[PDB]
């Protein structure tokens, strides 16, 4: 049986979620063809943490998780097993023991509108830094001053999210980028995902 989990649904598909609400799809009971991905020249950033390039296709895992979101170009560095900043501490924290990879490519032609597209959003404020693989979608309003914030919008107490100014004319650091995170759950459990050249194949 073909049993190929669809890379397109994670990459070739159109609708992408904002970074504060990174979409996660669980991956099990198929075969992953990594060769289809590391041969395309369209990706501009493609990093890995824990995996081999040549034996990439010959591995078996318990489960896989595919996260997808959209962020601008100059926040690509900010995703890493250890890193800080706006997105890293308030929207998406990669764990220090990260097992997997990160793909990212330019989406200026798709996610930018004339005069700017603001549908993509990112959290700008939170009281404690985000934990690894923690997706916070609370609309609670962030207190900045010592005066007790309250109500439904406050002075010096700002809404916790912000849109991206995605114009085609902005700098390339601002031109939008579609980003995918690949986490590899490896447990002492039934290994359901393998590659074309593993010992099960």
């Amino acid at each position, epitope marked *: 049986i073909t049993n190929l989990c669809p890379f397109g649904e994670v990459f070739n598909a159109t609708r992408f979620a904002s970074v504060y609400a990174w979409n996660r799809k669980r991956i099990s009971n198929c075969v992953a063809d990594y060769s289809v991905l*590391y*041969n395309s020249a369209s990706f501009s950033t493609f*990093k*890995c*943490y*824990g995996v*081999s390039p040549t*034996k990439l296709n010959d591995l078996c895992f318990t489960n896989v998780y595919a996260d997808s979101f959209v962020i601008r170009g100059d926040e690509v560095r900010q995703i890493a097993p250890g890193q800080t900043g706006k997105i890293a501490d308030y929207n998406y924290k990669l764990p220090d*023991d990260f097992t997997g990879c990160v793909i990212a490519w330019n989406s200026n032609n798709l996610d930018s509108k004339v005069g700017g597209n603001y549908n993509y959003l990112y959290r700008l404020f939170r009281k404690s830094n985000l934990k690894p693989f923690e997706r916070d979608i609370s609309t609670e309003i962030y207190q900045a001053g010592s005066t007790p914030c309250n109500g439904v919008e406050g002075f010096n107490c700002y809404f916790p999210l912000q849109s991206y100014g995605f114009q085609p004319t902005n700098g390339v650091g601002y031109q939008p980028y579609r980003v995918v995170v690949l986490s590899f759950e490896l447990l002492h459990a039934p290994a359901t995902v393998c590659g074309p050249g593993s010992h099960h194949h």
Partner: antibody
Amino acid sequence: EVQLVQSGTEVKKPGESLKISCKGSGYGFITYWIGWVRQMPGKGLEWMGIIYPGDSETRYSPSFQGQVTISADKSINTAYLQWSSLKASDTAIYYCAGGSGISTPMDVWGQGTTVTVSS
Amino acid sequence: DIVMTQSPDSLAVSLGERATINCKSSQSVLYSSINKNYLAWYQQKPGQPPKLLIYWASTRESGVPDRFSGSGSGTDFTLTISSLQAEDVAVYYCQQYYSTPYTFGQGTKVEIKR
């Protein structure tokens, strides 16, 4: 497959600045984090540095930081070597190597280039 | 920074017989998150660029002979060989790549006991 080539092998006198290159090609070349290693005349492989195409370098090992010489023009698949006031001991052979991730083995290597600074 | 040091400095072994090298790490670095060992060995013929022999001390590489194998427990890592041969001879080295600095190895020369 993915291969690497080097150049710049030369005789120089000390205190002079030289640039070498590691030019690579492959199907997936973005994966391959490039690191540099020195084999001096005496036996010993040092792993002087590390960088990635795009993004940034990974931290240079503590001893070499100070004569650090890393990379540029990442679009053209070359990793330049930029340093000055070279020591008389810097004469050695130097290789480049690559792997997929931050903590991954060196898969493919280059021919190597030797340099002499004996004045 | 973690120190990698090889057990045998020189080594003279006649062909068709087992030989073993071992490396010491200051802090064992394996299965911090994932099952393999994630340290490797390299061999470099004199006058040659070095090559790799096994990924993660448990993954043979393409074009690697089937008599080469590696077993590494904790901080000790034993590289064993089934039959020494003429093309097998080279300088041997370790790699540690779980932490951000690498120190490699002292260097294990090889001879022929003949």
